[PDB]
Amino acid sequence: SNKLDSKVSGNYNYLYRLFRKSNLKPFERDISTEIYQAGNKPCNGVAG
Amino acid sequence: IIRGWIFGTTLDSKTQSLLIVNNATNVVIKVCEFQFCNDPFLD
Amino acid sequence: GYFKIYSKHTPIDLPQGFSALEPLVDLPIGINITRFQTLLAL
Ligand SMILES: *[C@@H]1O[C@H](CO)[C@@H](O)[C@H](O)[C@H]1NC(C)=O
Ligand SMILES: *[C@@H]1O[C@H](CO)[C@@H](O)[C@H](O)[C@H]1NC(C)=O
3-state secondary structure C1-25: CCCEEEECCCCCCCCCCCCCCEEEE
For ligand 2, the distance from its centroid to the CA atom of residue B31, given in whole angstroms, is: 15
Cα distances (angstroms) measured from residue A32 to each of B9, B16, B34, C3, C40: 12, 10, 16, 22, 31
Tell me the three-class secondary structure of A15-38, residue by residue: CCCCCCCCCCCCCCCCCCCCCCCC
In the three-class reduction of DSSP (H, G, I as helix; E, B as strand; rest coil), residue C37 is classed as strand
Exposure string (b/e) for C18-31, b if CB count within 10 Å is 16 or more? eeeeeeeeeeebeb
Closest by CA to C31, choosing from A41, B26, A2, B19, is B19
Which chain B residues are Cβ-neighbours of C34 within 8 angstroms? 8-9
Residues of chain C in Cβ contact (below 8 Å) with chain A:
1, 30-32
C-alpha span between C38 and C42 (Å, rounded):
13
Return the residue in B31, B32, B34, B38 with the most chain C beta carbons within 10 A, the one to mutate for interface testing.
B31
- Strand-pairing partners, residue C36, are B7
What's the alpha-carbon Rg for chain C, to the nearest Å? Answer: 15
C-alpha pair distances (Å), C10 with each of A2, B4, C16, C18, C33: 63, 19, 12, 11, 29
